[PDB]
Structure formats: structure tokens, C-alpha cells
Amino acid sequence: TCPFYKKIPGTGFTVDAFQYGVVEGCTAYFLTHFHSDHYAGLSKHFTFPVYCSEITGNLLKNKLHVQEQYIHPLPLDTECIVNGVKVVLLDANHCPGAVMILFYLPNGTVILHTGDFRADPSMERSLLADQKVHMLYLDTTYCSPEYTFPSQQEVIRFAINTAFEAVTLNPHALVVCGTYSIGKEKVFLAIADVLGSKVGMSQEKYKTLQCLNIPEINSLITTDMCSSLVHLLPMMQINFKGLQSHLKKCGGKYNQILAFRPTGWTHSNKFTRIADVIPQTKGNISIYGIPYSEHSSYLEMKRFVQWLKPQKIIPTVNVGTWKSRSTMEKYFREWKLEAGY
Ligand code: NI
Numbered sequence: 001t002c003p004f005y006k007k008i009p010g011t012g013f014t015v016d017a018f019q020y021g022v023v024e025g026c027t028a029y030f031l032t033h034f035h036s037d038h039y040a041g042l043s044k045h046f047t048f049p050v051y052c053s054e055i056t057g058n059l060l061k062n063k064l065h066v067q068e069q070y071i072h073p074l075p076l077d078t079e080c081i082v083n084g085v086k087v088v089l090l091d092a093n094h095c096p097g098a099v100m101i102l103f104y105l106p107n108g109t110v111i112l113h114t115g116d117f118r119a120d121p122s123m124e125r126s127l128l129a130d131q132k133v134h135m136l137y138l139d140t141t142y143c144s145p146e147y148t149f150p151s152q153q154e155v156i157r158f159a160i161n162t163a164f165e166a167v168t169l170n171p172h173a174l175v176v177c178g179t180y181s182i183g184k185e186k187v188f189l190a191i192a193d194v195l196g197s198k199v200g201m202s203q204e205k206y207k208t209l210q211c212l213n214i215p216e217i218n219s220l221i222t223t224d225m226c227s228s229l230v231h232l233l234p235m236m237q238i239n240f241k242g243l244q245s246h247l248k249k250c251g252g253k254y255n256q257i258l259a260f261r262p263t264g265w266t267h268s269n270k271f272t273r274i275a276d277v278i279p280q281t282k283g284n285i286s287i288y289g290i291p292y293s294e295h296s297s298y299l300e301m302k303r304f305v306q307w308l309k310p311q312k313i314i315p316t317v318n319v320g321t322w323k324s325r326s327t328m329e330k331y332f333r334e335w336k337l338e339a340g341y
Pocket of ligand 1: 033035094116
């Protein structure tokens with residue numbers, strides 16, 4: 001049974017609710033982004049309308065084999081009518097194709113569902129600025145003050161300088177980058193670019209990247225492993241065993257691996273600046289954990305919410321425990337009293 005926080009009242013609409021069989025009354029299923037927790041349940045056998053971005057539609061067609069007739073892609077930043085209700089899709093600053101959705105209810109209520117997002121001050125000059133929002137369905141992943149991390153720019157700067165230094169000292173070193181879903185592509189694209197290489201990967205990953213409308217992508221990626229000195233691997237293989245094994249396969253082309261594991265937040269953030277980060281090393285293999293987030297920090301979320309001044313907030317993440325729910329409601333009240341809405 002679909003929980004309440006995936007339902008849009010006064011509509012036949014749901015958001016990110018494909019794992020419940022047929023939903024009573026739902027004439028249109030929205031998908032915010034192509035991450036597995038959110039699409040869970042979609043397959044080539046699905047027979048109801050799906051509304052999403054163009055990029056999310058490319059991935060549903062080609063990766064999940066949903067049939068074309070059920071895929072309804074919408075342009076961003078454009079007022080659209082769906083089943084007699086005005087909607088707008090906005091960029092979520094999450095992974096490729098990720099959107100927020102604005103619903104203008106027939107009775108005058110305005111609802112924003114963020115899906116997954118990383119809040120940014122640039123969102124204060126979208127179509128959100130134009131009018132008032134009564135309900136906010138909020139990505140609350142990191143809704144606690146201890147969740148700090150740097151900008152995506154500072155993290156990319158670190159990674160580029162790290163890779164460039166190591167490979168300039170040793171031209172026989174190989175760089176490896178972990179992945180398990182779309183998002184965070186900038187990590188491996190920026191590293192390959194400073195190294196003058198294409199990024200090499202499996203056929204299944206190349207296919208996924210081919211759906212994302214990245215400009216000049218054919219210049220940046222390849223399935224020919226041997227010609228490239230930046231390789232992508234599944235995240236689970238980014239360990240001393242998995243990397244040794246991969247190094248055997250390259251056939252004495254390389255004598256060193258430097259690898260990157262993009263995580264979300266980890267507690268090493270509570271004590272250590274990005275500049276100061278060090279790897280775990282075993283022999284000729286070094287692994288860096290780098291905190292590249294595609295979710296709001298506490299401060300970025302607080303800022304967005306105090307700017308938006310919603311009348312009511314419904315969290316969509318960390319909703320399973322009483323202590324979580326209670327903690328989140330406390331921060332919402334502080335924020336409200338500090339800004340005075
Ligand atoms: Ni996500």
C-alpha cells in the first residue's frame with residue numbers, strides 16, 4: 001500500500017510510487033529521477049502513463065524497456081497541462097534528468113515536491129519566485145547540523161590536482177573511479193580531461209551514459225579499455241582485492257593504481273578539511289574517499305526553506321523512526337521562528 005507522502009491530494013497523481021502494484025485512482029505516475037529506490041517496480045510490462053524529464057525517459061526506454069506509448073517526457077521550466085492540472089518541472093541539481101515538480105491544484109493550492117535535490121541559491125530565481133507555496137514535500141536526507149560537506153567545485157579541484165600530480169610523477173599509473181548508479185559523472189569526466197584521456201568502461205555503463213544528453217559525449221567515453229588511463233568500475237570492486245585483480249588484467253601496462261570512491265557524507269567530515277584528506281594505501285594501490293554530495297547540506301536546506309516560507313512541510317526521507325521525525329519537526333520550528341513566517 002502506497003504511503004500518504006507519495007500522494008498528491010485533489011489529483012489522480014502519485015510521485016515515485018511504482019512498487020505498490022496498481023494505485024487506486026492514479027491516472028498518472030510521476031518519476032522524479034532514475035535512481036532504483038525511486039523507480040522500483042517499473043519494467044517493460046508497465047501499462048500506465050509515466051511523466052518525467054527527457055533524460056529519465058531515455059533511460060526508461062533503453063535500460064528498463066518500458067514501451068514508448070507510456071513514456072511522457074516534459075520540457076523543463078515550462079507550464080504544461082496534465083489531466084487538466086497545470087504542472088512545471090524544475091532542475092533538482094541531483095543526478096542527470098532529476099526534477100522537482102510544481103503542481104497548481106484546481107482549488108488554488110500550490111505544492112512543490114523536490115524529489116531528491118541539492119538546494120542552491122540559483123533556485124531562488126526560477127519560476128518558484130513568482131508565487132507562494134502551501135506544501136513542501138522535502139528531501140530531508142541530511143536534515144541535521146552535523147551534516148557538513150564542501151562545494152562540488154572544491155571537491156572536483158582536489159580530485160583533478162591529486163590525479164594530475166600522481167600521473168605526472170608516474171606515467172605508468174592507472175586511475176580508477178567507482179560508480180553504482182547515475183550521478184557524479186563530473187568526478188571521472190574532470191579527471192580524464194586533465195589527463196588527456198577518454199574514460200573507459202563496460203558496455204552496460206557506456207549504454208547508460210549514452211542516454212544522458214551530455215554534449216560531445218562521443219569525444220569523452222569509450223568501451224576500449226586498453227586505450228584509456230581512466231577506468232570506471234562498479235563501486236563494490238573499489239577495495240585492495242578488487243583493484244589488484246583489475247591490475248592483473250591490464251597485462252603489465254601499469255604498475256600503480258590511484259582510485260576514488262565518491263561517497264555521500266562520512267564522519268571524517270566532522271574533523272577533516274577537504275585539503276587535508278589522505279588515502280588508504282597497500283603497496284602500489286591508493287584509495288581516496290571523497291565527499292561529493294548530490295543532496296543538500298543542513299545549511300543549504302535551511303536556506304532554501306527559509307527563503308520559500310512554506311505553510312507546511314512533509315519530509316520524504318528518514319521517515320521510519322519516531323526520533324527522526326521528532327528531530328526534523330524541531331528544526332522546522334526553529335527555522336520558522338528565526339525567519340518569522
Ligand atoms: Ni536519488
